[PDB]
Amino acid sequence: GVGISTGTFNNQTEFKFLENGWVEITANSSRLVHLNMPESENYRRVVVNNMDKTAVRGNMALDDIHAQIVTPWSLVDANAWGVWFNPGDWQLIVNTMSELHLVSFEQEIFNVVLKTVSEPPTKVYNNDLTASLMVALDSNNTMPFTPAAMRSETLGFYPWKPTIPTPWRYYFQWDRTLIPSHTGTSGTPTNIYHGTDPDDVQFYTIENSVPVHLLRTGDEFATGTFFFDCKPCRLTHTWQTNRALGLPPFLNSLPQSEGATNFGDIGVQQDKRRGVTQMGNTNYITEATIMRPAEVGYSAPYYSFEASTQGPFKTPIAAGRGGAQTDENQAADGNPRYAFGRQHGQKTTTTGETPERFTYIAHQDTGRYPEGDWIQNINFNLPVTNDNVLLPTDPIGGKTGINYTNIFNTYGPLTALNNVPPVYPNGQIWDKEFDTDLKPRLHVNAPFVCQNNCPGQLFVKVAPNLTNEYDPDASANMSRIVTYSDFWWKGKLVFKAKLRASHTWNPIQQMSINVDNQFNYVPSNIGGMKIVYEKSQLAPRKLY
Amino acid sequence: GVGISTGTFNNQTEFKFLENGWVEITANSSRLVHLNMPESENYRRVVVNNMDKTAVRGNMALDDIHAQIVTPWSLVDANAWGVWFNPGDWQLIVNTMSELHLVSFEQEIFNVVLKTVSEPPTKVYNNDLTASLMVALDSNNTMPFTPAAMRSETLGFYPWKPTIPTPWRYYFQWDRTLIPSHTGTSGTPTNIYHGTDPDDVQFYTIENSVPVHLLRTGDEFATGTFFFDCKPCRLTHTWQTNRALGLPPFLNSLPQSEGATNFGDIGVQQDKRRGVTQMGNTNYITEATIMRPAEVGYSAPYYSFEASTQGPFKTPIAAGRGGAQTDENQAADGNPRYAFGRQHGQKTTTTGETPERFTYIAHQDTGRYPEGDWIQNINFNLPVTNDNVLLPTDPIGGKTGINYTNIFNTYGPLTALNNVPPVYPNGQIWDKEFDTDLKPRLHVNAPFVCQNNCPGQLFVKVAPNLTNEYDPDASANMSRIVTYSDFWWKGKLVFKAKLRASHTWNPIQQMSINVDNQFNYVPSNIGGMKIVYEKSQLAPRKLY
Amino acid sequence: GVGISTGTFNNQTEFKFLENGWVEITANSSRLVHLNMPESENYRRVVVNNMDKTAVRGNMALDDIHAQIVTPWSLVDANAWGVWFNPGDWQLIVNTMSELHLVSFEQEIFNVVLKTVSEPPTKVYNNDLTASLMVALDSNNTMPFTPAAMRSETLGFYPWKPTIPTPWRYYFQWDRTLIPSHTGTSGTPTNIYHGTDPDDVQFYTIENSVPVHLLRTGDEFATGTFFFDCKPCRLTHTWQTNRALGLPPFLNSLPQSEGATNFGDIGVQQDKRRGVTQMGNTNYITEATIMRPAEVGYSAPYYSFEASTQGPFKTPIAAGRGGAQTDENQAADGNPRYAFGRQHGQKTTTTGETPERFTYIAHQDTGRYPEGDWIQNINFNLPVTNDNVLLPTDPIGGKTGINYTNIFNTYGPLTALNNVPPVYPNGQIWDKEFDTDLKPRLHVNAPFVCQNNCPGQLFVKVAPNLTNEYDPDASANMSRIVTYSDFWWKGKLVFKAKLRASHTWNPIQQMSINVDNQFNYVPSNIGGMKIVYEKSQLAPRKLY
DNA sequence: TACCTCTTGC
DNA sequence: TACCTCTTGC
DNA sequence: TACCTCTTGC
DNA sequence: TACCTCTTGC
DNA sequence: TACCTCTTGC
DNA sequence: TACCTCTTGC
Ligand SMILES: [Mg+2]
Ligand SMILES: [Mg+2]
Ligand SMILES: [Mg+2]
Ligand SMILES: [Mg+2]
Ligand SMILES: [Mg+2]
Ligand SMILES: [Mg+2]
Ligand SMILES: [Mg+2]
Ligand SMILES: [Mg+2]
Ligand SMILES: [Mg+2]
Ligand SMILES: [Mg+2]
Ligand SMILES: [Mg+2]
Ligand SMILES: [Mg+2]
Ligand SMILES: [Mg+2]
Ligand SMILES: [Mg+2]
Ligand SMILES: [Mg+2]
């Protein structure tokens, strides 16, 4: 009906506790979405070329050359923690849960409204009861997957603030070459956009692949419930590194008086100790020598850019680093860095077009400190001679700033690592898996990776509101009545988690409000707000 | 009952042959265990610091800095081949079995006895019928896993020799930095123990996590039967390397008279041969060029130390090397080296605190001979020019002792390798798997890795035998009656194996006693004994 | 049986989660208890008289005069949080529970052992199998209630440290007068111990009121399960004070730019506002004037000593105070202060007979800041004149240090307050209710007050081990064989709690380990330990 | 509209 | 809303 | 034609 | 206590 | 002795 | 272990 409401606005998060410490977390979210008619009603294949920037020989990393199909459709993406949980709820989950399971997700569009503008510069807004809001749900997942969280373009993080969907667009194949160089490179290094391989051309259109529903004012649209199928995510971090795996050496001499300099001593000549090592050469059995079952973490090339058919790209790392050689200042390769606007956590009363940022440094110790790496000749005659060792200080290729660890890789059959932790609230929640024959062991952008089909994407678009003069036979762009729509969106994301118990004698890490952060969880006198990032795997767990 | 025995001493190994060549090997083991009261009744958090040794710039590999919780409990660990099989039995298994499956493990403590000492320096020993022996079985596996085999601290390998458990202790988190250096490094390289990250603090106590049973003289304690769930272990070695995979080249000319210099010849110009290769450049099809399905083995960095949050540690390798470029003298990276005492195989009548050792060199050929590696320019114009090849002889980073193979890594989607072989008798049998999201494909310390829960650890401790003067309100350490206990331990480890059959025309490798080793399997005139290590995968098997 | 164990040592704390967010917390506790034979086998009625101290006219508060029956029995008291929960468990309860219910309590004595000493000064300890340990359980509650927590004399807080019961003794009626005085009081103020009112004489003996069980070595003793019946205890604190109850005044003018000095203003002359007040005189309606439903908290006389038949005593207060006019330095009347030894949380390696202390300052804001109180003439003509107001600065009785608030009392039919919060670990858990006709609304020493019968007290005593020369007909004290006993105690305290949910947008207070407290939850390198007090009602709750 | 969640529901 | 179609339908 | 035997049989 | 294992058992 | 609690129990 | 007895039993 025209003058009837088709739904409920619910942003309540329910915690249903079940037998055996299981909890069914039901996150409800609703937002008022604002949508304008498309720039143009057509699909465009556009190429982006920032040649003048990558032509500065030393600037390869700043390459932006790519091709894309620009569609007249908008994308309603809610894949981001900030859309479902507020700080308070997040605290509860993170402090008391041990593991989190992604169960299901359903969403609907209701209370649709379409208005038109008519214009001394004074506008007037009216309701066009007959105008339609086009909704398309790509359930089959034909359209290429384009998670908005990667560009901080999801829905708003505050329930009492209207939001908007993002103009949908996807990558169109293109070949491109760009040879790396440095400040002093002589000549002009090849840097060109080759074009398109017809054999890889894929031009998709919502119209030809998805049934489109036309919603008028009294219409609503709901997707069914979609059940995820993916590994659980842990809310505990490991701390043990190869150096803390197994039975420690027996201390034959213990300290007899308190102090920070009163150590205990093993008490056996390093070369007369009993035990096992993988060094068939020496009889030295030290903590750095003793054999460990496998290897926690791995070393990978840092700030390595590889290039294939379409240009260079950063080689991704699984884990960050951090610790007492750390702490958002040294924050090197591996630690994700989120940049975002006012809709997703930046002080809303802040002016200027500079985003808010943060580098997420996980509590899990599975990274590497290259400065501490080194390689020595197999003969293992120590103290090691300069010619018999390769340090992170010895230059590679005559370059003063590149050492071996920079191109080093220790991934292998003995590598053990953990999946990335949830980044509240700017992080992505679930992600689609690659359609390659051999798949990656994890993704660095989300903890949940649908093994099957991921929920299909939801597209919206304001139907063309034609005037009385329309001539399709003409070359000029069609003139439409300025129309826009505002509709309500409601989602329900359901997780299942397990409550934790206390196994150590000591208490553990817990997120808490205090005198220093207190003002990050309350509005200002102007009504300003912000959502500060929070770590997720606070409690520790044994790794072995 | 006080004057009644609660068990049987059985160290018999049963071989039950079943239909279809399957055998149920039941290894029974019993030992008389001796246990003294703890140093102190308290738990201590101790730090070990051998700064003065790692401060010798060239000595990083000798680092021992670590923290550990020292408990008053002792650990009864029987995870080591030497505890269950004698040479004779091992021979049978190794010579006639093809694969070995770890089935179950159960153990019990019986005939408990507690005595007290009382003291011209003449001691007197009495039975304290009321004194108790505390037994705790961490079935849930809350305590961190600390397999004693890694430090040769399991139970004794001879059934007729009393043994003892080891003082239990586990790693306590700590941060620590140590920058590598060499003899001629100028200045003082950072080498410090930072402390502890509260976020990773885990102080466990037997008392707060495991129910403790108090056993008096007439008491016994038995664990139930525990069934393992892990991949089978093979008792055959592969010998084929990439060079021996598939159809050999057809010899167009065969030799016509015996001799070691009368070879056959392929008989087709190397560049006129038919076949397949992954080198799109040349038409050369040689044995080192012809395409093989995948790659057996992989190259990894040798004598590489990586470092994370707690110090440096050796990067582990999956396989050893060996062969005609071998044989316990060159014995380089990958080959495990065991050091051990008299309880585990060293001549028992030997004096001195120097351990017995051996580097285990597996019969499987899946290693690498770096000296034979090399890399050449893609243009493949040969004979190759010096500037177009990188040999294991060309220095990397200006270091005379470091070549590319030293930092090289060829692990990849085409890598194929085998799990580590059993090392009798000093090797560990089963091992717990890491509690990381992505797990290692194997462990280098044991053939069996419980996919589920590994049998929980068994802890023992002599209950405090207080005197009449005890004041808990005091700071001084409590004085106890010198008490100790001797109890009998009996275990039953069950495997299932498959008998082998003869498929080749030639006979194969078999372990056998002869004129040279004969005296390693018999006691001396003094009653000395020893247990010499033995190889396990004697017979060969096709790999492809 | 003599050589058989009669029990299990269990100090595990189980958390059983049920449907609807309820949790059944089962705290198990076991300790090795050490017990010496009594000083004397007789009951003594002793009077304590510290006349010489209270005779210093200004020292009344230091009075210790009292009479007591000294029994040869010892009391095994486990009524104290520290006996049942370690820091880790306490953290879990306090951070995630909303309310706590005391359900049941059962305990047993097992593995009894009796030894005798025999004596160059060298002692020898033997087992006297026939000697008995007397156990008496006053289930009917005939003996006067004497909770040991009040004098920090409960069982030990660490499961791995033997403990001891306390010599039982109870108050014997006595009359006594002591007139207060001050430094300059002239003459000698009456200060005397009158004696005993026969009409109030109550001499109780364990022997005549409780059946006593004789336990020899192979004996055990268990009480049944006892179910408590008392109000639940909340784990949330209220923060609202009369000034924050109800609908705030409507701000007619809001701030327009961020800042800590940009306030909003009500915007209506204080005497032209609409609303309700209990001041029939004026038309002023201010925040301190507007009528509130009732009164949170109450004002009581501070450092008031009252005196009845047996001497002076401090008038107890229900709530503390604290806040930004606070914080363990100003910590005045109402805030409990615990003093204790090494058995209950003081650094165990600390020497000296000085106790460890702390003043518990509750998170609940229900106290008073006298400095802010005042009283003014009913005519309410302001600004108030000196003669028309009585400030906390105006002297009462010509005394410079006493003001009206000192003798002030605002308890009344409109008073609302909360029960005392749990003080971990030194606080008492449950308490017996007074057998008076009109009972107190709460106790200040414990959150749980059994409405019915509280669990009866458990007494122990070493039976007389006579020598061959005993003549009861003699006046001399009987000579006994030096005997002592060590027995194991195990208890099970069960609570039921409700899990909390997140209702605010902001996160809340949570106990957590950090860089500053980290070392309070881990043993030292000497094996030192300590248990630091923790607050219990961290989360806030609405009061109205 | 039920005692700061779903749920005075099941 | 199911794994680029209709169709995780029949 | 079944995972180097008979036997992916019985 | 059975013919050098479990097993003159099942 | 089951996958850091009770509980691979019910 | 039940509300200072036996008896929160009968
Ligand atoms: Mg469909
Ligand atoms: Mg092509
Ligand atoms: Mg850390
Ligand atoms: Mg169990
Ligand atoms: Mg930290
Ligand atoms: Mg070979
Ligand atoms: Mg009774
Ligand atoms: Mg009288
Ligand atoms: Mg406050
Ligand atoms: Mg409700
Ligand atoms: Mg389909
Ligand atoms: Mg076959
Ligand atoms: Mg037989
Ligand atoms: Mg369990
Ligand atoms: Mg009674």
Swiss-Prot record, chains A, B, C:
The chain holds residues 180 to 727 of 727 of the full protein. Its main location: virion. Belongs to the parvoviridae capsid protein family. The N-terminus of VP1 is sequestered within the mature capsid. It contains a phospholipase A2-like region and nuclear localization signals that might be exposed by capsid modifications during virus entry. The capsids of autonomous parvoviruses expose a proportion of VP2 N-terminus and part of that sequence can be cleaved of to form VP3. Changing residue 65 to T: In strain: Y1. Transmembrane segments: none annotated. Keywords: Capsid protein, Clathrin-mediated endocytosis of virus by host, Cytoplasmic inwards viral transport, Disulfide bond, Host nucleus, Host-virus interaction, Magnesium, Metal-binding, Microtubular inwards viral transport, T=1 icosahedral capsid protein, Viral attachment to host adhesion receptor, Viral attachment to host cell, Viral attachment to host entry receptor, Viral penetration into host cytoplasm, Viral penetration into host nucleus, Viral penetration via permeabilization of host membrane, Virion, Virus endocytosis by host, Virus entry into host cell. Interacts with host TFRC. One of its GO terms (biological process) is entry receptor-mediated virion attachment to host cell. It is found in: Virion; Host nucleus. One of its GO terms (cellular component) is host cell nucleus. This is Capsid protein VP1. One of its GO terms (molecular function) is structural molecule activity. Disulfide bonds join 450-454. Mg(2+) binds at residue 140. Capsid protein self-assembles to form an icosahedral capsid with a T=1 symmetry, about 22 nm in diameter, and consisting of 60 copies of two size variants of the capsid proteins, VP1 and VP2, which differ by the presence of an N-terminal extension in the minor protein VP1. The capsid encapsulates the genomic ssDNA. Capsid proteins are responsible for the attachment to host cell receptor TFRC. This attachment induces virion internalization predominantly through clathrin-endocytosis.
